[PDB]
């Protein structure tokens, strides 16, 4: 079961930001609202926006920020990379304990998809190795954020900016730096070749075992390097020794050595499913981390 | 297409914990009432075949420990309604949303806010199977977690969690304490009926495929509803009801494909198979997206 973090602490931070005829979402923390800077663009701007030039021509009053029924007055603005920081005269009393983090490819996070400052849905995503995310985002979703929650603390890792022609998604960390080679201009952009997140496939195979499904297992083993040669051939990410270590708990819990599971995955890559399924899926799933699998079996 | 849950914040604001002795589970605090599974009053020994009426007569308001976080909520009345306990408390929950209690039909989906000790752990989308089980992710201490949909301002609570079956699927009640399906809250082995495929949701999924331009499977024929239902049953698909036909109305109107024409297309897929083709990038027909889920995601 793909499980998202409860979204309430983030919902209390979502607001609507309008500049001209463009509306998207912002993240309101203490007295600052964070949003994608392309809100300040028009059509004649989209293709090669000189953002510093476009922004110097704006006044605080060109930014309409709405939290529910209430307008928040903008008293100052600045730009950090691809994010605009709007200072407002009110502090958000619902601001959670938080930090900004930049996540690594292969890590997972929850997305709170919003439209016109209103939360619409929540789901789990992974940062792909090619730094896209396979999200569900429509017009008006920009400024939706991705996050993880640990104890009382919300770690914001993603703010949404764009869709690629292939239907995957691209965005920034909360410092406004893109994940991947993408640019906030209105042009058709391709990503690099994606690969499958191998440590996550292995965690999901252990999950299938824990839950009684183990038809894909075999009596064989493999060395780490020989597995990695096969993985790379099938556009799977290499498995590191730290990945093996990270998988220890699941290996212990099931009594299946990591390199034994690697041998099973090799067999699946070479043979296929035989038209069968694992945990319901006809495809190998790679957006559960070892931590995810552990926490949901704990 | 992915399972998308509703934002959980309005339900998070309603979760509490309810303890009787050492048995702790979750409760739902709306206005000045806390709702929770009645088996909270059972010792791990009453659970074999509890006499719930006799167990409740031995309890008093002061035997129930209700906490929102570490803050005790004083209980001032208690009653049992089917398989749920209603604990009247002396504080109205200031975070009570607009809400209603609804009893859903098989095939309908809902979000579950999985909770432990009154604390939310995660949120995910579930479908009520035709055999009245859900495939949840529930561990010990999850009972009293609820399932819900949100429409406009309003939370429609439809599920409260009570138990796991031998097979690992999950069973529970509506918020009036009436179980979905033929289950009882006793620690006995109970079997669900054989499961079937949720036809109305597969049809919704075929409509979504058409909306996205994937329409190779549309054929020139049509069928009656009765003929389709009789065929569908031979493939372990649910028969359609009139309400199913109606809730496909909007997708039929969006695509211009009559419901019964889509039924004829599905019937051909059932009888002839996919012949190696995929739909929406899948050789498997998906049955856990309702017609409303398709509208939610695509708009
Ligand atoms: C913000 O809400 C918006 C979210 C998008 C809209 C649909 N789904 C989403 O996730 N963001 C955008 O529309 C950005 C704005 C830029 C200034 C960063 N652009 C896009 O997401 O465009 C997507 C289309 C593939 C792009 C494309 C562009 C230009 C073409 O012609 C030369 C062709 C295709
Ligand atoms: Cl008929």
Swiss-Prot record, chain A:
Sequence ranges assigned to domain Peptidase C30 in this UniProt record: 1-298
Residues of the active site: 38, 142
Record annotation: effect of changing residue 139 to A: Does not affect ability to cleave and inactivate human TRMT1
Notes on activation and inhibition: Inhibited by pyridone-containing alpha-ketoamides compounds 13a and 13b. In turn, alpha-ketoamide 13b (tert-butyl (1-((S)-1-(((S)-4-(benzylamino)-3,4-dioxo-1-((S)-2-oxopyrrolidin-3-yl)butan-2-yl)amino)-3-cyclopropyl-1-oxopropan-2-yl)-2-oxo-1,2-dihydropyridin-3-yl)carbamate) inhibits SARS-CoV-2 replication in human lung cells. Inhibited ex vivo by michael acceptor inhibitor N3. Inhibited ex vivo by compound 11a and 11b.
Record's protein name: 3C-like proteinase nsp5
Assembly with partners or alone: 3CL-PRO exists as monomer and homodimer. Only the homodimer shows catalytic activity. Interacts with host FBXO22; this interaction promotes the proteasomal degradation of nsp5.
Coiled coil (residue ranges): none
Organism: Severe acute respiratory syndrome coronavirus 2
Complete-protein stretch covered: 3267 to 3564 of 7096
Function, in words: Cleaves the C-terminus of replicase polyprotein at 11 sites. Recognizes substrates containing the core sequence [ILMVF]-Q-|-[SGACN]. Cleaves and inactivates human TRMT1, preventing tRNA guanine(26)-dimethylation of tRNAs. May cleave human NLRP1 in lung epithelial cells, thereby activating the NLRP1 inflammasome pathway. May cleave human GSDMD, triggering alternative GSDME-mediated epithelial cell death upon activation of the NLRP1 inflammasome, which may enhance the release interleukins 1B, 6, 16 and 18. Also able to bind an ADP-ribose-1''-phosphate (ADRP).
């Amino acid at each position: 079961r793909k499980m998202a973090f409860p979204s309430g602490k983030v919902e209390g931070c979502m607001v609507q930001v309008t500049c001209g005829t463009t509306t998207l979402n912002g993240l309101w923390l203490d007295d600052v609202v964070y949003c994608p800077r392309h809100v300040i663009c028009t059509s004649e701007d989209m293709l090669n926006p000189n953002y510093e030039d476009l922004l110097i021509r704006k006044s605080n009053h060109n930014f309409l920020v709405q939290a529910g029924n209430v307008q928040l007055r903008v008293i100052g603005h600045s730009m950090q990379n691809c994010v605009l920081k709007l200072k407002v005269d009110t502090a958000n009393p619902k601001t959670p304990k938080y930090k900004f983090v930049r996540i690594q490819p292969g890590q997972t996070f929850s997305v709170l998809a919003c439209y016109n400052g209103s939360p619409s849905g929540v789901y789990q995503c992974a940062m792909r190795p090619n730094f896209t995310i396979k999200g569900s985002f429509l017009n008006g979703s920009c400024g939706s954020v991705g996050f993880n929650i640990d104890y009382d603390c919300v770690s914001f890792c993603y703010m949404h900016h764009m869709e690629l022609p292939t239907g995957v998604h691209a965005g920034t960390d909360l410092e406004g730096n893109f994940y991947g080679p993408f640019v906030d201009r209105q042009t058709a952009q391709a990503a690099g070749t994606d690969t499958t997140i191998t440590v996550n496939v292995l965690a999901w195979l252990y999950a299938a075992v824990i839950n009684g499904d183990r038809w894909f297992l075999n009596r064989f083993t493999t060395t780490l390097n020989d597995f990695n040669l096969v993985a790379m051939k099938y556009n799977y990410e290499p498995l590191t020794q730290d990945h093996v270590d990270i998988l220890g708990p699941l290996s212990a819990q099931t009594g299946i050595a990591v390199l034994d599971m690697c041998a099973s995955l090799k067999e699946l890559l070479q043979n296929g499913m035989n038209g069968r399924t694992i945990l319901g899926s006809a495809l190998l799933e790679d957006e559960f981390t070892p931590f995810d699998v552990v926490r949901q079996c704990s």
